[PDB]
Amino acid sequence: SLLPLSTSLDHRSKEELHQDCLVLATAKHSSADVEERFHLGLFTDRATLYRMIDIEGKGHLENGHPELFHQLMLWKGDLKGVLQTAAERGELTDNLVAMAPAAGYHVWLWAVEAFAKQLCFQDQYVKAASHLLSIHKVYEAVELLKSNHFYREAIAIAKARLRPEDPVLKDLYLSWGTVLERDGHYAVAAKCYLGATCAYDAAKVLAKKGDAASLRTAAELAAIVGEDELSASLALRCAQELLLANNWVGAQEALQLHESLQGQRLVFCLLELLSRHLEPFVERVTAVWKSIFSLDTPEQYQEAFQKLQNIKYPSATNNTPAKQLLLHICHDLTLAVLSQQMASWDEAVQALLRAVVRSYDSGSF
Amino acid sequence: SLLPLSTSLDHRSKEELHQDCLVLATAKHSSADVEERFHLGLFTDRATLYRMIDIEGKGHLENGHPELFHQLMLWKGDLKGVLQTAAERGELTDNLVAMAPAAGYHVWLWAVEAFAKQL
């Protein structure tokens, strides 16, 4: 058990025990004979059981039980010495630090501070951070935790200690988000940026994913945080990225989140009509605009055109997939069918010529 | 690890994370929607991550890890309460008594005296 050597050399032959008793009688009544048998320190005097305990401690190596090794000094009473020598060999543990304040408060503080290091090299940074929290080392309990690549617990501790207006918590959010940027987890990065009371970059990091659903969610987030033009740009960008597989009406309703993409809405209507034509038109277009989009009056029919003539697309060279080529052609056709009525036909014929030239240029027959 | 529930309901589908981000944006800018998802307490405010930690603690029974259960209150800061309730259920341990003198000397004395009985 705790003293295997004593119980081993205490159940010997009866003659051995008789000799031990004789030696004890000789030593008690008065002494190099008692030195050979250390266990008589249990009965002889105080100066001998100390040596017996020391022998037991140095014998407590082969069984790998440093807890009893360090507890024996508590019986001897040298708590300070065993605490000091335990950290040097990397043997300080929770058991030893339990009686750390027995010798004094400063002794306990030294014990926990030293145990923090060993827990650091023993992949126990959470326990170390808790121990630094014990002496109310609030600021230090988070820097090592985040440096050890543990941001969730660090932020939890910082919020538990520090008030929300503290400057040493937003840095945790920004650092965790920046780390997550390269990891490809843009949603949680946007969450971290949102929690850092700076949502301007949250929409951008959410949009950085590139998926149409991610683009739309970034648009909605930017609308929520008050970035109206940013949300409008995000919706416009998700519009084309939604049209690839089979989605036409989904992008039609996605363009509705802000009241600045009505021209894009009626252009994507032409996209749908031209795509269906691949399975008159100039009047069916405006009829569908009147019916579905509920825009039937010359009044706004001009101001819905002036916002569509202000944007220009690239030259649309030969090397490009036909999708955005058709999108640009249909946008120009929409501009033509707009300008054909409220003004002279010069703009209509010019826009029709522009559309036909764009279609011809990119080798598209 | 220490918070299996958070890392479980934090690696969900991308649409779920987008909805969580939308709810966080709605709650930050001003709220019964944030109550359903407790992990937003990590980002929302102080009054919510306390409830998240409490939920984690009450979920720390099925895995049989009372050490983390009692360490979570150290993060929350109620060392006295966790020390007092640990002895009643027979869960006071060497780890808990390590930070016993953090709240005070008499607290440590009570902690060791109570741990003596359980031992």
Curated annotation (Swiss-Prot), chain A:
Changing residue 105 to H: In NEDCAM; uncertain significance. The modification Phosphoserine is found at residue 1. It is found in: Nucleus, Nucleoplasm; Nucleus, Gem; Cytoplasm. Belongs to the WD repeat gemin-5 family. It is linked to Neurodevelopmental disorder with cerebellar atrophy and motor dysfunction: An autosomal recessive disorder characterized by global developmental delay with predominantly motor abnormalities, axial hypotonia with decreased or absent reflexes, gait ataxia and appendicular spasticity. Affected individuals have cognitive impairment and speech delay. Brain imaging shows cerebellar atrophy. The SMN complex catalyzes the assembly of small nuclear ribonucleoproteins (snRNPs), the building blocks of the spliceosome, and thereby plays an important role in the splicing of cellular pre-mRNAs. Most spliceosomal snRNPs contain a common set of Sm proteins SNRPB, SNRPD1, SNRPD2, SNRPD3, SNRPE, SNRPF and SNRPG that assemble in a heptameric protein ring on the Sm site of the small nuclear RNA to form the core snRNP (Sm core). Part of the core SMN complex that contains SMN1, GEMIN2/SIP1, DDX20/GEMIN3, GEMIN4, GEMIN5, GEMIN6, GEMIN7, GEMIN8 and STRAP/UNRIP. Part of the SMN-Sm complex that contains SMN1, GEMIN2/SIP1, DDX20/GEMIN3, GEMIN4, GEMIN5, GEMIN6, GEMIN7, GEMIN8, STRAP/UNRIP and the Sm proteins SNRPB, SNRPD1, SNRPD2, SNRPD3, SNRPE, SNRPF and SNRPG. Interacts with GEMIN2; the interaction is direct. Interacts with SMN1, SNRPB, SNRPD1, SNRPD2, SNRPD3 and SNRPE; the interaction is direct. Interacts with cytosolic DDX20/GEMIN3 and GEMIN4. Interacts with SNRNP70 and HNRNPU. The WD repeat domain mediates binding to U1 snRNA and to U4 snRNA. The WD repeat domain also mediates binding to the 7-methylguanosine cap that is found both on mRNA and snRNA molecules. The regions that bind snRNA molecules and the isolated 7-methylguanosine cap overlap at least partially. Besides, the WD repeat domain mediates interaction with the 60S large ribosomal subunit. This is Gem-associated protein 5. It comes from Homo sapiens. The gene is GEMIN5. The chain holds residues 847 to 1240 of 1508 of the full protein.
